[PDB]
Every structure is written in structure tokens, then in C-alpha cells.
UniProtKB/TrEMBL annotation, chain B:
Keyword field contains DNA-binding: no
Main localization of the protein described in the UniProt heading: membrane
GO cellular component: membrane
Residue span, RCK N-terminal domain: 7-125
Subcellular location: Membrane
Protein's recorded name: Putative glutathione-regulated potassium-efflux system protein KefB
Residues of the full protein shown: 379 to 528 of 529
Amino acid sequence: LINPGHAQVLILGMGRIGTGAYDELRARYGKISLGIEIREEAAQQHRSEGRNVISGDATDPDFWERILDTGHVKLVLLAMPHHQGNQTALEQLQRRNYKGQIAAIAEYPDQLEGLLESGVDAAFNIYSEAGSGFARHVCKQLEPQF
Amino acid sequence: QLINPGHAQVLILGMGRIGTGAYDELRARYGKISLGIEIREEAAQQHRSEGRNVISGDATDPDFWERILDTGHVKLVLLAMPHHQGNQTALEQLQRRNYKGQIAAIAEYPDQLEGLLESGVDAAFNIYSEAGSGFARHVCKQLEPQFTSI
Ligand SMILES: Nc1ncnc2c1ncn2[C@@H]1O[C@H](COP(=O)(O)O)[C@@H](O)[C@H]1O
């Protein structure tokens, strides 16, 4: 947040998924991410916890035109796997002439397929990612002597 | 119908998508050290056709556990069942056979994770937090975005 407004990563949805992604990116790159969260209470709690998060609706074209389309964004993470959130936000992003990368995480197989078909650069399954992270974090915390 | 886990050092209870990602992630780092237990016979067969050591069985059933040989190098159990109470029941079964190694669990909500810790697991992680972490990790590795680090 050295230069406010200059986030290079947008994380759309700051539930547990978005937050996990936010924390990982911070660890690697420092403070280059902005998370977007529709629930105001949730956004305020993230800000209290020291994360760069604002409230707003990633399906609203005006929020895109007024706020999110800054010209600095290199990567957008779609972390709204329920209620067609990912696909709806993707639609808005594509209307804007966005030249960066897009990645999505989805709950089911056919959902990943539709996201890739609609032009996301990379798509992942929530649970397969969770299993991979789980195994790493366990080996980190417990250091089993294999 | 005794079950000899052989050289397995990790028992993975539940081989749905979570257990499978864990199995594969461990295989990548440590080689063939895991044994998956899966209630769905057709899923267990599909895992075996893919080269994974997976046997069918219900890890909530005391009769399943009675089949398992006390001789074993198992140092880590991953609780990756699809139903939260299943992980809790599996943990109880492991405790009443006096298992000494470590146990890790994954769940949906902080109360579930705290409850697993209270019940005796060594580490407890949230399914969706872990998903977001691995999501970001894999996106960076696949896509190699060019950021200015701050
Ligand atoms: N349109 C949206 N804009 C920003 N955040 C959202 C939007 N829809 C859902 N979220 C948040 O994304 C997270 C996961 O949402 P869900 O897709 O319901 O699991 C939750 O914190 C939601 O409040």
C-alpha cells in the first residue's frame, strides 16, 4: 500500500478462500494485493486484521468503471465459487478491456471447464487445492520424521 | 480379511478430492509412503487403476479397525472424510486402539477445528483457507505473473 490505488492483484471475494490466497501472496510479494468483499462487516474486520480490503460488489459495472479498473491490475483472482459469482464478475471484467491475467477457483469439475472456456487463464478445484495445502501445512507444523 | 498396511507411514482416511490432493502432494515430496482408506468401492478401484495405494473400508466402523494389523510404521494419520462427524468417529477409533503417532485434520469451520484439537488431533486446518493458499501458490507457479514486490 506504498501507493494506494496501485494494487497489482485483485482478489474478488474475501471469504476463507480469498483470505487464504491474500495471505499467501502477501508472504511472497508483500503488499501488492487488494481484496474485494461485498459484506461490509467482513471487509471492516479484514481491515482491523491489517489486510488491504475494501467493500464493494464485483458484479456491478459501475464499481468496475469507478473504482476497480485502475489500469494497474496484472492479476485478478476469482474466489466467489457460489451463486455464479465467479462467472458474473468475469463477465464485468471482460467488458472492460482488461489486458492482464485471470485465475479462478471453483467447487465442481464442469464449473472449471466453463471458466476456462470463457477465457480464464487458469482454473482450480477448491478441494484438490485444499488437499495439497493441507499436506504441506501439516508437514510444516508437525515435521514428521519420514 | 486382515489389513496389513505394510510399509505405509501415512494413513489417509477419505480419498475424495481433499485426501487425493494430500496423497499426491506427499507422493511428490516423499514417494510412496501413504495408504488411502475409502468407503466407495468404485472410487477405491479407480484410485488403484491410477497407481494409488487405496483400499476400501469404513473408517468409522470398529469392525474395520479390528482388521488392521498392529504392526506398522504409521507415523501420521490424515483425517479427510467427507462428513465432519466421520473424522471425529475415526479419531475415536484410532484412540481406542492406542495409536501413537500424530494426527491431522481438516474441516470447514473454526468450531469444528477447535473441537478436533480438543479431541486430540495434533494439527487442524481449514479446508477453504488451505484451498486459497494452494490456489495462489499454483497460480503463481503456472502463470508466473511479473509483479513489482513491495
Ligand atoms: N459480488 C461480490 N463482490 C465481492 N465479494 C463477494 C461477492 N459475492 C460474494 N462475495 C464474498 O465472497 C466470499 C465467498 O462467497 P461465496 O461465493 O458465497 O462462497 C464471501 O466472503 C462473500 O461475501
